[PDB]
Every structure is written in structure tokens, then in C-alpha cells.
Amino acid sequence: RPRFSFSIAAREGKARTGTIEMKRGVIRTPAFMPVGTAATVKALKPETVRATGADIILGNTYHLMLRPGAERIAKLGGLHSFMGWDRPILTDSGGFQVMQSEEGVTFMLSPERSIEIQHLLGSDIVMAFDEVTPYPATPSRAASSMERSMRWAKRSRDAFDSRKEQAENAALFGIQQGSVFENLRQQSADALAEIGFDGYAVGGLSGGEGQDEMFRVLDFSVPMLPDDKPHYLMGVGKPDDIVGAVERGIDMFDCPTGQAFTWDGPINIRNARFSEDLKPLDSECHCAVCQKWSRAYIHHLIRAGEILGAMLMTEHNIAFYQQLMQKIRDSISEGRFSQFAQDFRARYF
Amino acid sequence: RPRFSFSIAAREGKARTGTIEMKRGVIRTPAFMPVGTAATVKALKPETVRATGADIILGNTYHLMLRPGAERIAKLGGLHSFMGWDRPILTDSGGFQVMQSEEGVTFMLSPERSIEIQHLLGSDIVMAFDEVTPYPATPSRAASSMERSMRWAKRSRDAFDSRKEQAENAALFGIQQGSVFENLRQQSADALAEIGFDGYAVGGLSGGEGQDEMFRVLDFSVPMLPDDKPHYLMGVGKPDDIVGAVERGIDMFDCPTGQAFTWDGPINIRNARFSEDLKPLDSECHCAVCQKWSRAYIHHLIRAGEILGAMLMTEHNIAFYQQLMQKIRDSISEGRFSQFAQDFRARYF
Ligand SMILES: Nc1nc2[nH]cc(CN[C@H]3C=C[C@H](O)[C@@H]3O)c2c(=O)[nH]1
Ligand SMILES: Nc1nc2[nH]cc(CN[C@H]3C=C[C@H](O)[C@@H]3O)c2c(=O)[nH]1
Ligand SMILES: [Zn+2]
Ligand SMILES: [Zn+2]
């Protein structure tokens, strides 16, 4: 297996489906990444995460760097070994969760330390360290913040490249900034392209703007990124946000872990209407949870504060997301994604 | 399969090993029963409980009767169906957890209502409803309380018998009382024998008396019970308590769910000495947890308050108990239990 190979198998409009091949495994795209925060995907063993169909998980850096510590995890063999997940892991840069000088942020985290921490963890996909642009942001501030991010993007590239085992075995993604402003998004895309990355994230969205504005920014922002590399929309996860985002060119997502997702829309299982409902969470869902337990039981578990309630709810929700991703991939491959998208939200809402 | 058949396969001194056959499955004895409190064994799916080797679980009645409600559980198909465990379930009578007139206790729970609630749950082994004798207790009070329990024992027998589906499909155990007093224990055994039960519990112990006194009471108390029926020691669960209890004639236990059990004694995984320990919880343990994760990881999980920490700790501890039970059964079968018991506690302490 190569360090990194993204291949597009099929397209429909702006949507793409394909694969990212890496040394630890193949990632099917468009891809949803369950999040692990303190080296665990909440309430699930790694084997359960895999069984839902996840190909890659996201590891939060901020928490790991505080506990148990990046050096400690490296001493113990790296994050994959520590937590028992042997497939790819994408690590975030740690900054969002902190988030201040040109060198970085003390709360000490800088482009270089971030990349070092991700190396210590043994991350497969490394995120460049950026500066959080708050929403809303004035043009001047978004610009200043975007420029700083591009300087930090270059520092991230050079830090990554200066570490041979990292350079040979991991991938590096850059993050586009610029708030909602087209010209800033363009300058940002151009800067990142000039530096060169294995993949490109759209940062700065899903922060109060609302879906309409997010989609509008995506409309012009994703075509600015290199077409031949993956496009990652950071911190976007509602099912309808994902479908629309894929319609605009996005290949990767992270964010499911009383709310249960269903094809007819989210339900809150604690609601009294489910107390004697023997149906599964979702009548079409293939997950082991819907195979074996009723709404009534999970309703009881969650109302009683039982851990098994969290376990079941999480497994269902992550499986639901992976099934969504699978339906998206198949429909693009089959050239019926536009219809899928229409059908999905006629029923979802 | 018969409603109930206890067969003793081997003996060594007072210790016995055998089987209880019931319609939902075979219970290997001596047996350890994981406890389910609100229709779940904490942090484990039923399939995981089974994988540890449990043959039967205990369901707490008190909690179920409050939430979600016994009638509701019956409406939904019974406890086995509700929670996804299809093997035998022993239910307690609900009284300990409440615990006042001759009719019962309002907090309304009486012999008859208790037996009814256990029927609604679809319990396989039904516990007679008794009166809690506190420890310590004067002779007069233990006697009064024991007498009341024997009256309630007869009421429990007749309530159970008056319900054909229960009588034909479930078993009924009586509970011996009498605190630490031999003559009261004898009167109690005699009363219960005269009424007749499928099994006999030793109630009233493990309540401050300490292991030495408990063993001393067991010394004279268990031989008073019918030899040919199972002997259940209620609410006794430390590994060393179990070994000593089996040496005295006990066949069933309930009580494992930061403390991890090991063959060298309990450890508290949160202790800083384990933060970089890559060994499993126990180096001889066969459980899936010790197959895959280190002390260091579980230490981190528990210190971080992660649910996966509780999941792993619980699975290990219950597996450890089932392995203990298996070692006990094999050593009795092989006539080397006395040596096993000696070896166990030379290392355990
Ligand atoms: N580091 C990184 N991580 C991330 N997670 C989610 C987002 C998208 N950001 C938006 C979410 C909150 C902030 O106010 C910003 O408006 C992102 C990013 O832009 N960069
Ligand atoms: N109902 C029933 N459940 C039970 N769980 C544990 C015990 C053994 N009891 C002792 C534990 C607490 C009390 O002070 C009593 O000293 C038991 C019982 O004797 N009866
Ligand atoms: Zn499901
Ligand atoms: Zn173990």
C-alpha cells in the first residue's frame, strides 16, 4: 500500500466517490469519521466501530495532549496500539479546542508542536495548524486570520516534511479559511495549492451561519481547491448537511455520538411516546442494535441513566451515518445521486 | 428440558459441583450470577455477559417495579425479551432494597405482590419474600423476624402455586433466616423443608459480621438445608468469600460490576503505578479485555471518566468471576478442591 493515493471512481455533477489508499487501510469516499476524544469513540469498542462500517476515525489532539499526554502515548506504542484501532486515524491540530501570537497559542501550541504531537500519536492524516476565525467576522479580521493561517500552513508543511518517518508514512492536509468571503477563500486556496498538500479541508464553517449560508460558501469555495485531492468539511455532521455538502464536492466529514437518527428524521428516544414501542430505532436500519432491541428498551435505558443505553444509541447512530455514506457512494457510482438527495430529504423532513 | 432438575456430579467434603437444568438452559454449579439492576448488567450487552461464561443472571425486582414497571415489562413480552437475555434469570423478591406489617411493606409489597411481580417479569427462579433481619440482631428480634419470614415463605409458596404458568415453568427458592443463632437457623431450615422448595437460600449474612463469623454461621447452617437441592448464599461475592462458602456447601452466588480482580488480589487501576503498564489486567486471564488492552489504557479510560473504561472493567471482572467458578467446578470434579482453595488464597493474599 502507498502512503497516500486518492482515486476518483465516479462523479455526478460536483459529487465524487472513490477511495483513499493508505498504509493502514482503504478509506471509501465520501467518508464519515466517527470521533474519538480521549482515545476512545464514546461507548464503543474499536471492533464495534469497525462493524458499523467506519474506515477511519478522528482523534482529538487537544484532549490527548492533556491526558494521557502525547509523549506517554508514543512511549506506549502510539495511539493505534494504545486504543486498539489499527486502521487509519485522522488527527485534528488541537487548536480549535484551545481557541495568542504569531508563534502560536499558550493556554504552548504552535504549528511545529502540533505537528509533533500528531507524530507522537502516530496519526495517518495530519491536519495543519490554523487560527480559528470566529463567525461572524469582519473582512479585515477574516483576512488577517486567513493570512496567519496560510503562514502557519507553510510552517506545518515544513515541520511535517522535516520528520522522515512522518513524511514517509502519513499524509498532511491544509485548511482553507476566509470566513464567508469569496476573495479570501480564493487567496487561501491559492496559497494552500502553492504549498501543496495531500488533501484540503474547508475550515471556518458550521459556526452559526446556518445551512443556507454554509452551502452558499461551499458553492464557490470547493471548486477553488485542487479537484484531484480529497475535500474535507470540518465539523459538519447533520445528515442533511452531509448530503448537501457532497452535492457541492465534499469527500470527508466528522462530527451521532437521547437523539437517534432515522430515515424519517431524528427522534428523541426519551419521549414518552416510545415507552411501549417495540419497533427498532429505525425500521430499515441494518445495525445490530435494530436487529435485537426495541425503542421501548432503549427509552428505558436512557431514562434510567444506564451505560448500555449510551452504548446502543451510539452504535445505532454511527451505523446510521455509515449506511448514509454507503447510500451516497452507491448512488454516485450509479449516477442517481441527485435523485437520492431529493428522495432523502423528502422523507427526512 | 424439565422445569427444574438439580443433579450433583461430584463432591469433595461439603463442596458439590453439578447442574441445574431448566427450560431456558443449564446452570453449572457452583454458579456466579452477574446482577442486572434496571434490566441490564451494567455496561454489557447480553451477548458479552454470555461470552464471559455466565449461565444465569440475577434481576433486581425493586428497581424494575419502579422503572419501567412490572406490568409494562409483561405487556412488552417479559424481561428476557425486553433485555435480550434468553437464558435463565433469577429474580430477588424486591424487599431487601425497600428494607412494615404482617401483610408486607408500604414504601405496597407483600409475599403475594412480590411473587406476582416476579411472574410478570417472567422470572425462571423466583425468591420467596422475606423480612430483612438487620445485623447485629438480638435473639428475640431475630426470632420474631425469622418466624415472620417463615409465614411469608408459606404465603410465597401458595401464591406461586396458585399461578399455573408460573408453577409449571419457574422454580421457587425459600430463604433461611435466624441471624447468627444456630437454634433459629435450625427452626428456619425445618420450616422451609416442611413447606418444600426447589432451592434454599441462606439469607441474613454479609451485613457487617465479617468473614470469620459468616463462615462460622455457614458451618452449621448449610448442613441443615436439604442436601439434594441447591444452596444459594445471597449477596456474597468477594472471591475469597466464594471459595470458603463453596467449601461449606454453597452452590450459588450473586454480587465485580476502578477495582479489577486478579489472581494476585484486587488492584485499583486508577493508581499511578499503572499509567505506563502495558500488561493486561491479569496475566492469566482469558477474557477478551486482557487479550486486547493494557492496564495503561484502562487506567486512562477510568481516570478520564470514559464509558469504555466501565465496559472493559466490567467485562474483565465478570469474566474473572466465571473463570474462578470454572476452576472451582473443575477442581471439585477432579477431587483437588481443597488444594485449589489453599493455592488460591496463598496467592490471592
Ligand atoms: N481546527 C479546525 N477545526 C474545526 N472544527 C470545526 C470547524 C469549523 N469551524 C467553525 C466552528 C466553530 C468556529 O467558530 C468556526 O466558526 C473547524 C476549523 O475551521 N478548524
Ligand atoms: N432479600 C434478601 N436479599 C439479600 N441480599 C443480601 C442478603 C444478606 N443480607 C444482609 C445484608 C444486608 C442486611 O443487613 C443483612 O444483614 C439478603 C437477604 O438476607 N435477603
Ligand atoms: Zn440501527
Ligand atoms: Zn481479563
Side-chain angles (χ1 to χ4, degrees), chain A residues 34-41 43-60:
Chain A
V35 176
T37 294
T40 160
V41 177
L44 304 168
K45 290 180 170 170
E47 63 198 87
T48 304
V49 176
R50 176 57 179 168
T52 66
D55 288 330
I56 168 165
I57 63 171
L58 182 147
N60 287 144

Short mmCIF file of all heavy atoms in Angstrom, two decimals, chain A residues 34-60, unseen atoms left out:
data_model
loop_
_atom_site.label_atom_id
_atom_site.label_comp_id
_atom_site.label_asym_id
_atom_site.label_seq_id
_atom_site.Cartn_x
_atom_site.Cartn_y
_atom_site.Cartn_z
N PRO A 34 -16.07 8.78 12.59
CA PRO A 34 -16.51 8.88 13.99
C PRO A 34 -15.41 9.59 14.76
O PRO A 34 -14.23 9.47 14.45
CB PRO A 34 -16.71 7.44 14.41
CG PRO A 34 -16.95 6.71 13.12
CD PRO A 34 -15.99 7.37 12.16
N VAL A 35 -15.79 10.32 15.80
CA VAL A 35 -14.75 10.99 16.60
C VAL A 35 -14.45 10.21 17.88
O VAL A 35 -15.37 9.76 18.56
CB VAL A 35 -15.19 12.42 16.96
CG1 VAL A 35 -14.16 13.09 17.87
CG2 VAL A 35 -15.40 13.22 15.69
N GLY A 36 -13.16 10.06 18.16
CA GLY A 36 -12.60 9.58 19.42
C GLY A 36 -12.07 10.77 20.19
O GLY A 36 -11.29 11.57 19.65
N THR A 37 -12.46 11.01 21.43
CA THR A 37 -11.98 12.26 22.04
C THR A 37 -10.78 12.09 22.95
O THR A 37 -9.77 12.81 22.83
CB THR A 37 -13.14 12.91 22.82
OG1 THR A 37 -14.11 13.30 21.83
CG2 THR A 37 -12.73 14.18 23.53
N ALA A 38 -10.84 11.17 23.88
CA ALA A 38 -9.76 10.82 24.80
C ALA A 38 -9.34 9.38 24.47
O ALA A 38 -9.40 8.50 25.31
CB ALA A 38 -10.18 10.91 26.25
N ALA A 39 -8.93 9.17 23.22
CA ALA A 39 -8.52 7.90 22.66
C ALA A 39 -9.61 6.83 22.78
O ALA A 39 -9.31 5.66 22.97
CB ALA A 39 -7.24 7.35 23.28
N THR A 40 -10.86 7.21 22.65
CA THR A 40 -11.95 6.24 22.53
C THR A 40 -13.13 6.89 21.78
O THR A 40 -13.43 8.07 21.98
CB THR A 40 -12.37 5.69 23.90
OG1 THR A 40 -13.69 5.13 23.83
CG2 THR A 40 -12.48 6.78 24.95
N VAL A 41 -13.80 6.12 20.94
CA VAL A 41 -15.07 6.54 20.33
C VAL A 41 -16.10 6.24 21.41
O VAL A 41 -16.16 5.05 21.76
CB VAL A 41 -15.41 5.81 19.04
CG1 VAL A 41 -16.78 6.27 18.51
CG2 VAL A 41 -14.29 6.03 18.01
N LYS A 42 -16.79 7.23 21.90
CA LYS A 42 -17.61 7.11 23.10
C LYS A 42 -18.47 5.84 23.11
O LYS A 42 -19.29 5.58 22.24
CB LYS A 42 -18.49 8.34 23.24
N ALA A 43 -18.23 5.03 24.13
CA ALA A 43 -19.06 3.87 24.48
C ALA A 43 -18.99 2.74 23.49
O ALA A 43 -19.83 1.84 23.52
CB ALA A 43 -20.50 4.33 24.67
N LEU A 44 -17.99 2.75 22.60
CA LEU A 44 -17.82 1.64 21.68
C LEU A 44 -16.41 1.07 21.66
O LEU A 44 -15.40 1.78 21.59
CB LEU A 44 -18.11 2.11 20.24
CG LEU A 44 -19.48 2.73 19.98
CD1 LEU A 44 -19.45 3.37 18.60
CD2 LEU A 44 -20.59 1.70 20.07
N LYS A 45 -16.30 -0.25 21.67
CA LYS A 45 -15.03 -0.89 21.36
C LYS A 45 -14.67 -0.63 19.90
O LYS A 45 -15.56 -0.50 19.07
CB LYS A 45 -15.13 -2.38 21.56
CG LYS A 45 -15.25 -2.86 23.01
CD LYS A 45 -15.36 -4.37 23.04
CE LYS A 45 -15.24 -5.01 24.40
NZ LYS A 45 -15.60 -6.47 24.31
N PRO A 46 -13.39 -0.56 19.56
CA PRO A 46 -12.97 -0.40 18.17
C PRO A 46 -13.58 -1.40 17.20
O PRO A 46 -13.91 -1.01 16.07
CB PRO A 46 -11.44 -0.66 18.22
CG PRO A 46 -11.07 -0.19 19.58
CD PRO A 46 -12.25 -0.57 20.46
N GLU A 47 -13.72 -2.65 17.62
CA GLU A 47 -14.33 -3.67 16.76
C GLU A 47 -15.78 -3.32 16.43
O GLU A 47 -16.28 -3.61 15.32
CB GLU A 47 -14.23 -5.04 17.41
CG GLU A 47 -14.96 -5.22 18.72
CD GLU A 47 -14.42 -6.44 19.46
OE1 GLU A 47 -13.43 -6.34 20.22
OE2 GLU A 47 -15.05 -7.51 19.24
N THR A 48 -16.48 -2.65 17.36
CA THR A 48 -17.86 -2.24 17.10
C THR A 48 -17.90 -1.06 16.13
O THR A 48 -18.77 -0.93 15.25
CB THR A 48 -18.57 -1.91 18.42
OG1 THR A 48 -18.48 -3.07 19.27
CG2 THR A 48 -20.05 -1.62 18.23
N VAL A 49 -16.92 -0.16 16.31
CA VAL A 49 -16.82 0.96 15.37
C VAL A 49 -16.61 0.43 13.96
O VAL A 49 -17.23 0.87 13.00
CB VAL A 49 -15.66 1.88 15.76
CG1 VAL A 49 -15.51 2.99 14.73
CG2 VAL A 49 -15.89 2.50 17.14
N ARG A 50 -15.70 -0.54 13.83
CA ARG A 50 -15.41 -1.12 12.52
C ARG A 50 -16.68 -1.78 11.98
O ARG A 50 -16.98 -1.70 10.79
CB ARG A 50 -14.21 -2.08 12.57
CG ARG A 50 -13.94 -2.78 11.24
CD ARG A 50 -13.72 -1.81 10.08
NE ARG A 50 -13.44 -2.53 8.83
CZ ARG A 50 -13.45 -1.89 7.65
NH1 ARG A 50 -13.73 -0.59 7.58
NH2 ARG A 50 -13.20 -2.56 6.53
N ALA A 51 -17.43 -2.44 12.85
CA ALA A 51 -18.56 -3.24 12.36
C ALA A 51 -19.63 -2.35 11.77
O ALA A 51 -20.40 -2.82 10.93
CB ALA A 51 -19.17 -4.09 13.47
N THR A 52 -19.65 -1.09 12.24
CA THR A 52 -20.62 -0.18 11.66
C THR A 52 -20.28 0.20 10.22
O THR A 52 -21.13 0.77 9.53
CB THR A 52 -20.77 1.14 12.45
OG1 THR A 52 -19.54 1.85 12.34
CG2 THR A 52 -21.09 0.86 13.90
N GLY A 53 -19.06 -0.08 9.79
CA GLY A 53 -18.52 0.24 8.51
C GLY A 53 -17.53 1.41 8.45
O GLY A 53 -17.12 1.79 7.34
N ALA A 54 -17.15 1.96 9.60
CA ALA A 54 -16.17 3.04 9.56
C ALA A 54 -14.82 2.50 9.06
O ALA A 54 -14.36 1.43 9.47
CB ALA A 54 -16.01 3.67 10.94
N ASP A 55 -14.22 3.30 8.19
CA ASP A 55 -12.91 3.01 7.63
C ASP A 55 -11.80 3.79 8.31
O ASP A 55 -10.65 3.41 8.20
CB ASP A 55 -12.94 3.43 6.15
CG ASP A 55 -13.77 2.55 5.24
OD1 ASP A 55 -13.90 1.35 5.51
OD2 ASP A 55 -14.26 3.09 4.22
N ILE A 56 -12.16 4.90 8.97
CA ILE A 56 -11.16 5.78 9.60
C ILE A 56 -11.89 6.48 10.75
O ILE A 56 -13.08 6.69 10.64
CB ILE A 56 -10.61 6.78 8.58
CG1 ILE A 56 -9.80 7.93 9.16
CG2 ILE A 56 -11.75 7.36 7.75
CD1 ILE A 56 -8.98 8.68 8.12
N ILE A 57 -11.19 6.82 11.83
CA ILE A 57 -11.75 7.61 12.93
C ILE A 57 -10.98 8.91 13.09
O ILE A 57 -9.82 8.96 12.63
CB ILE A 57 -11.73 6.82 14.25
CG1 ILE A 57 -10.32 6.45 14.75
CG2 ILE A 57 -12.61 5.59 14.10
CD1 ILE A 57 -10.32 5.86 16.15
N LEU A 58 -11.57 9.91 13.74
CA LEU A 58 -10.83 11.15 14.03
C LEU A 58 -10.34 11.11 15.46
O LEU A 58 -11.16 10.81 16.31
CB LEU A 58 -11.73 12.34 13.78
CG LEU A 58 -11.15 13.73 13.96
CD1 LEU A 58 -11.77 14.71 12.98
CD2 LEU A 58 -11.37 14.23 15.40
N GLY A 59 -9.09 11.44 15.75
CA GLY A 59 -8.64 11.56 17.14
C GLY A 59 -8.47 13.02 17.49
O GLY A 59 -7.79 13.77 16.79
N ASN A 60 -9.10 13.45 18.58
CA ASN A 60 -8.94 14.80 19.08
C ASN A 60 -7.59 14.92 19.77
O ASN A 60 -7.28 14.09 20.62
CB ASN A 60 -10.06 15.12 20.08
CG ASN A 60 -11.44 15.36 19.52
OD1 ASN A 60 -12.45 14.99 20.13
ND2 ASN A 60 -11.57 15.99 18.37
#
